[PDB]
Design a protein around this ligand. Structure first.
Ligand SMILES: [Co+2]
Ligand SMILES: [Co+2]
Ligand SMILES: [Fe+3]
Ligand SMILES: [Fe+3]
Lengths: 314, 314
């Protein structure tokens, strides 16, 4: 049985079904929450996560992959509770989410030591439980590929080669961080088809997106649930274009919706069209209807949400 | 009653007695410990902290100030347990320990919001307890005064003006971060005598140290318990020189000893002389004996370890 699930027995990858590849039940800074618990309400976070997951299931979602890892408040016990309340298939991961430097812990420590943490979570279990990690998550953003960012990428490659689990990335779509992640990983012997380069939906630079897809990795059109770089309308145009041009077998779509997130609220921007309701089901309300009425058939939807995740985890 | 104590009623500053102004019962990365608890042993950390505190008390230490804050694993409940086991007067603080950027939580949040966290810990209590913070801790290092580092400095000034608690800093002695911290704080209306500029013992650049002292702030010769920038022998020479030159009333001495720390072990260096045993009592075994046999009298020791802390907290 291929894929470990939180609070359940492992499943064969062929049985993953309709999958959301990048969603967060919760996201927060470990340090802030430890130091100022008065800012947080776990009961509200729990209710929000359960409600969102239930709504996803009502649209036919069978499996959710949650790439919350170190730096963003991964909590396997919170996750297992959401599973108990919903019955969702939930895939947890391991990894480190940094943009610049590692925590002081990692002073004088090797790439192998970092990889050992990942392999621990994959082979032994997460945070003292028998729930195992099913993928590795890594990140890079505006600061680019720093020394420490590269250390983490190389550690992810070691983990993949040992355990065969895939790698999901966070990138900044407006620099070449995604291309660099793919290059470094494949140089270190990672199968390109075992990599999802994240947040490429944040740009409309189609040639850059296709370049990564052509090199054999999945491309993450994965932030439909954030009011980030690109509006939903323009994301949809980019998604449609890539489908028209034959890239369905590389496309992965998700919301990157955080059922709760601890970030401060940004100044709101109002456009001619009423802002879309951001949630874990926006693609069922907006994106998928938009695609269907623009001529893309059911086989495309099945490819993106079923076949592609199956391959990724195979 | 001026100064709040962990697990005890507050004390008048005049009763603080012989004080170690900068020690850590424990230090670790919140994120690393949350994600990989298998790396840590709280029972060993507890035994180490209790043992060290007891040994300090055997040399006449009455009060320990512990500037462990966000980023370095402050845990008020661990602290209160050490107090119960030892009877030490322990002063806990609030603040943020960063060198570059704030956690993602602080995106779109103001300096006033940051200050509110500090004031919460000072006026209401720490981590859901009635133990209150008695000072603010801030940091800057090799990256210098970044945007976010400056935000935290300015928030500390607001907290001081509202609550009158002093400010302890971490600086890098080989750039001008300490001088910059002092300048920014005093510009924002902080009394220079309510600031301890930390880690100046890391350099032998006496003119730089005196410059900060002359501007009215305490100078931290405060890393006797680390095998860091400067060896103990050279620290001792610098300490003696400053005393000879009349700076006793600005000098604060401590170890910055971490009874446990989670950092990887650096490559050892062996010198002609047997390496000193690093602990929370090294100054009683090495530094203070060295000073005494070089002619500095008991009044100097009383000034540094009793009178200076009294003023700082007055
Ligand atoms: Co991301
Ligand atoms: Co320091
Ligand atoms: Fe994400
Ligand atoms: Fe320290």
């Amino acid at each position: 049985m291929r894929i470990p699930l939180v609070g359940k027995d492992s499943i064969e990858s062929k049985d993953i079904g309709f999958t959301l590849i990048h969603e967060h039940l919760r996201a927060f800074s470990e340090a802030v929450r430890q130091q100022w618990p008065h800012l947080y309400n776990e009961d509200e976070e729990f209710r929000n996560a359960v409600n969102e997951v239930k709504r996803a299931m009502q649209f036919g979602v069978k499996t959710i992959v949650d790439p919350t890892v170190m730096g963003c408040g991964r909590d396997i016990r919170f996750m297992e509770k959401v599973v108990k309340a919903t019955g969702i298939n939930l895939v947890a991961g391991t990894g480190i989410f940094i943009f610049i430097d590692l925590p002081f812990y990692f002073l004088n420590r090797s790439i192998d030591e970092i990889a050992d943490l990942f392999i621990h979570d994959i082979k032994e279990g997460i945070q003292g439980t028998l729930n195992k990690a099913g993928f590795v998550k890594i990140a890079a953003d505006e600061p680019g590929i720093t020394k420490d960012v590269e250390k983490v990428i190389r550690a992810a490659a070691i983990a993949n080669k040992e355990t065969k689990v895939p790698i999901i990335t966070h990138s900044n779509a407006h620099n070449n961080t995604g291309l660099e992640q793919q290059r470094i990983l494949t140089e270190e012997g990672v199968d390109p088809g075992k990599i999802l380069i994240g947040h490429l939906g944040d740009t409309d630079n189609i040639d850059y997106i296709k370049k990564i897809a052509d090199k054999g990795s999945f491309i993450g059109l994965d932030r439909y649930g954030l009011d980030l770089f690109l509006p939903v309308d323009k994301r949809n145009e980019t998604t449609l274009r890539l489908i028209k041009d034959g890239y369905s077998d590389k496309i992965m779509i998700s919301h990157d919706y955080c059922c709760t997130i601890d970030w401060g609220t940004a100044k709101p921007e109002y456009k001619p069209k009423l802002a879309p309701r951001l949630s874990i089901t926006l693609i069922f309300e907006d994106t998928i209807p938009f695609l269907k009425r623009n001529g893309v058939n059911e086989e495309v939807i099945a490819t993106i949400f079923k076949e592609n995740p199956k391959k990724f985890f195979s």
